[PDB]
Swiss-Prot record:
Changing residue 152 to A: Reduces 2-oxo-dATPase and 8-oxo-dGTPase activities and increases thermolability. This is Oxidized purine nucleoside triphosphate hydrolase. The keyword Metal-binding applies. It holds the Pfam family NUDIX. Binds 2 Mg(2+) ion per subunit. It comes from Homo sapiens (Human). Widely expressed with highest expression in thymus, testis, embryo and proliferating blood lymphocytes. Mg(2+) 1 binds at residues 34, 54, 97. The gene is NUDT1.
Amino acid sequence: ASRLYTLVLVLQPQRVLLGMKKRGFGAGRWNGFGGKVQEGETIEDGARRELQEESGLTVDALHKVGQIVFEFVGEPELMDVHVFCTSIQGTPVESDEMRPCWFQLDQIPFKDMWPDDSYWFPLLLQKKKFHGYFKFQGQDTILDYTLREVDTV
Ligand SMILES: CNC(=O)c1cnc2cc(OC)c(OC)cc2c1Nc1ccc(Cl)cc1F
């Protein structure tokens, strides 16, 4: 009972782009860019499409960096999130849904991000690949988790 999602991190040598979500689920937190994979679409094509819809950026080469499953206690559907890292074109676009901002790598706003990010961002920043699972109670509490580095996602 899992649904496919993507998440894209635009990570440059000294900064990362994140978007402040204005509405819907996750509003008020800085996030990568992502959403649901569509019918007939590959996961990677979904990742490229969502980065444009949410940030206005065009990505050619995407690299898969992780897979994280999110469980919300009581909720039937698990989120199977395929995480990718990016060479981009365009300038980030602020829209009604998302306010993008560049962050220096020592200024990541973990306090205003989903709590799981604190666990897997140190891996992302060090160019590691990973598999994770986080079980949440509500939006603020991690009940339990697993996180492992892998050679292949
Ligand atoms: C830079 N880290 C993130 O951006 C990020 C981190 N953790 C998340 C945890 C979540 O629930 C437990 C979650 O539920 C909607 C969203 C998360 C999330 N963003 C995100 C946005 C849109 C999708 Cl489709 C998928 C995502 F993971």
